[PDB]
């Protein structure tokens, strides 16, 4: 009888600990999310004082992990690529970020507007179709 008594109260407590564990895991998830957010802000204040990175257009890729880059608006340097970007992806005529001190290609920014796209935008030949044409 007392074995059944124990096992009954033990199972009651097992249920209690189980549901409390689900509850505590939810609370821990909430707390961790909030703490990560706050830590992100406090490190943001610190890492926003870092020098901004220049933007330069790659004109030609050298060997030994170096790239010829025209940095806006004056200057044509050769910069060593960062060890996170496959040099095969820096094909000429593409915008790339260069670290402030000791220029180092560390990101391939979205490609500049195609020169042909810019030229056609300047010319502005109205778009046409056979249904617009008649006669």
């Amino acid at each position: 009888g007392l074995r059944q008594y124990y096992l009954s109260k033990i199972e009651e407590l097992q249920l209690i600990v189980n549901d409390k564990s689900q509850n505590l895991r939810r609370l821990q998830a909430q707390r961790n999310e909030l703490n990560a957010k706050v830590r992100l802000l406090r490190e943001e204040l610190q890492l926003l004082q870092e020098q901004g990175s220049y933007v330069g257009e790659v004109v030609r890729a050298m060997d030994k992990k170096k790239v010829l880059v025209k940095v806006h608006p004056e200057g044509k340097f050769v910069v060593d690529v960062d060890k996170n970007i496959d040099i095969n992806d820096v094909t000429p005529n593409c915008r790339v970020a260069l670290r402030n001190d000791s220029y180092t290609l560390h990101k391939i920014l979205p490609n500049k507007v195609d020169p042909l796209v810019s030229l056609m935008m300047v010319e502005k030949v109205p778009d046409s179709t056979y249904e617009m044409i008649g006669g």
Binding site: Q28, R31, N32, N35, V38, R39, E43
Partner: protein, 191 residues
């Protein structure tokens, strides 16, 4: 009391009074102070007090100290590191070692110092097979010592960590309770 030092004294008094007892009331008070109180020094003292109170059951500390270590306040993280060290001193707890390993290389000089010191306290009188992190932490200590990147307080932590690891000719362990299960008052006071 008004004085932050008096509040820290209250935290340490709770630690000493309830050392080893694992009294839930003391845990509640210490943890609430570590959370909500307005001074970082007393927050750290409260976390260390919780570490003191939880050493009879070294399996329990990892949870709370993890929540307080993957955390907000640099002082709270450091207090969690020392709480883990005090709790697991002489136990070589794999969970505590795993918790402290990320804490090393933290963006705070004293946090790194405390993590290293607590790690050495935990691996006191340990070897590779008992816990497969002793060599990792020893090489970490050596690099930190013979590096110039690390801050002066990180260097201090590394020297103290090596001293703890090889303490007593590597023939001594730090146990807050005697081998017969009695709280070792000299050890509690020393820690």
């Amino acid at each position: 009391d008004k004085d932050p030092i008096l509040r820290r004294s209250g935290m340490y008094t709770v630690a000493m009074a309830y050392c080893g007892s694992g009294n839930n009331k003391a845990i509640r008070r210490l943890l609430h102070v570590a959370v909500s109180d307005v001074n970082d020094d007393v927050r750290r003292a409260a976390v260390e007090s919780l570490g003191f109170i939880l050493f009879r059951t070294p399996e329990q500390c990892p949870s709370v100290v993890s929540l307080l270590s993957e955390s907000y306040n640099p002082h709270v993280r450091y207090g969690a590191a020392m709480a883990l060290g005090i709790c697991c001193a002489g136990t070589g707890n794999k969970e505590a070692i795993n918790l402290l390993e990320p804490m090393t290389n933290d963006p705070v000089n004293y946090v790194r110092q405390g993590a290293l010191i607590a790690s050495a306290l935990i691996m006191i009188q340990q070897t590779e097979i008992t816990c497969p992190k002793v060599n990792q932490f020893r090489q970490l200590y050596s690099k930190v010592i013979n590096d110039k990147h690390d801050d002066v307080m990180a260097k201090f932590g590394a020297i103290l960590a090596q001293g703890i690891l090889d303490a007593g000719g590597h023939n001594v362990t730090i146990s807050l309770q005697s081998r017969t299960g009695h709280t070792h008052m000299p050890s509690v006071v020393g820690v």
